């Protein structure tokens, strides 16, 4: 059919880590997608990981086109925007909405980890919503392979966003990839339930992080959180990554399995 390969760039959806994201509409079909435009090693890695992704809670990759210097990465659009924009400052969101998003985030993260990929920058800006409020993990710029031929490799590069980063990445030379992603899902959950981040970074000099280690849950944000989701947070936000809860065990948690509105 003539013209089915042409896309109109309609509006900017934002600037991400590397380059702008635009809404693109097919001239023939009217299909609406997102395109990441990059004016170009790093991005050969991203494309490679992006082509692996096939899951309902992960942004799908439709292909790429190079036009001289510029690369165009075509991806599933999430017409509902970001989870960041559903979180009300100082309030968060209703507990049942947060639970459903949490279930969907774990499903995506289980998937990634099962194909041996770690995302490394989980936060509400990178968690996108489709038309039915289904959550999708987006942005694979920092993602990397942590398991290959059934052998794990330890990570050593420090990246992410400080309020979301696990404390081992500030303290240790090398660390396991999976508990880092788990930890960040815990900060996300805290943000959904309280509408605020518990600390600037999880270090020994941050008084809010010390308070948490001393169990001062009569302070904010913890005071705003019901005891059941808080008991789960107590198992996620554990400083020793070897003692931190894993995802199979999160799936057995009582709040995780609680029926809610
Ligand atoms: C990480 C990031 C940064 C900027 C834009 C996007 C982004 C925003 C979006 N939908 C919408 C709908 C409405 N707004 C504002 N945004 N859909 C997407 N699908 C893949 C994306 C990617 N990367 C992406 C993602």
Q: Where are the domains of the chain?
A: 1-88, 89-261
Taking the C-alpha atoms of residue 185 and residue 217, their distance in angstroms, rounded to an integer, is: 19
Tokens 């023939």 -> residue: 28
**Can you tell me which atom of ligand 1 is nearest the CA of 33?**
19
Tokens linked to 186: 């815990």
- Centre of ligand 1 to C-alpha 216, Å, is 37
- Centre of ligand 1 to C-alpha 14, Å, is 7
Does 121 contact ligand 1 (Cβ within 6 A)?
Answer: no
Taking the C-alpha atoms of residue 101 and residue 134, their distance in angstroms, rounded to an integer, is: 8
Q: In the annotation, is 204 catalytic? A: no
Question: CB neighbours of 62 closer than 8 A, spacing ≥ 6?
Answer: 33, 74, 75, 76
Does 237 contact ligand 1 (Cβ within 6 A)?
Answer: no
Experimental method: X-ray
User: What is the second-level CATH architecture of the domain 1-88?
Assistant: 2-Layer Sandwich (3.30)
Closest Cα to residue 187, out of 175, 199, 177? 199
- 107, with CB counted inside 10 A (0-12, 13-18, 19+), is middle
- Centre of ligand 1 to C-alpha 166, Å, is 25
Does 46 contact ligand 1 (Cβ within 6 A)?
Answer: no
User: What is the second-level CATH architecture of the domain 89-261?
Assistant: Orthogonal Bundle (1.10)
Annotated catalytic residue, options 85, 121, 226, 249: 121
Closest Cα to residue 20, out of 77, 73, 61, 67? 73
Output 216-221 pairs: Cβ under 8 A, ≥24 positions apart.
220/194, 220/196, 221/190, 221/193, 221/194, 221/195, 221/196, 221/197
């Amino acid at each position: 059919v003539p013209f089915v390969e042409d896309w109109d760039l309609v509006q900017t959806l934002g600037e991400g880590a590397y380059g702008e994201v635009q809404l693109a509409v097919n001239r023939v079909t009217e299909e609406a997608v997102a395109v990441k435009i990059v004016d170009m090693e790093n991005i050969k890695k991203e494309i490679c990981i992006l082509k692996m992704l096939n899951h309902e809670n992960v942004i799908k990759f439709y292909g790429h086109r190079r036009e001289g210097n510029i690369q165009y990465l075509f991806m599933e659009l999430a017409s509902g925007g970001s989870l960041f924009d559903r979180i009300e400052p100082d309030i968060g969101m209703p507990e049942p909405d947060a639970q459903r998003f949490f279930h969907q985030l774990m499903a995506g993260v289980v998937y990634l980890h099962g194909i041996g990929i770690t995302h490394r920058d989980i936060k509400p800006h990178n968690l996108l919503l489709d038309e039915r409020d289904n959550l999708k993990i987006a942005d694979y710029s920092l993602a990397t392979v942590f398991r290959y031929n059934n052998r794990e490799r330890l990570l050593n590069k420090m990246c992410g966003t400080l309020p979301y980063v696990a404390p081992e990445l500030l303290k240790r030379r090398e660390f396991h990839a999976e508990p880092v992603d788990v930890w960040s899902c815990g900060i996300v959950l805290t943000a959904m339930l309280a509408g605020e981040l518990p600390w600037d970074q999880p270090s020994d000099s941050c008084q809010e992080y010390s308070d948490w280690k001393e169990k001062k849950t009569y302070l904010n944000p913890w005071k705003k959180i019901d005891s059941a989701p808080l008991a789960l947070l107590h198992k996620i936000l554990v400083e020793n990554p070897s003692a931190r809860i894993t995802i199979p065990d999160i799936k057995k948690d009582r709040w995780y399995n609680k029926p809610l509105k």
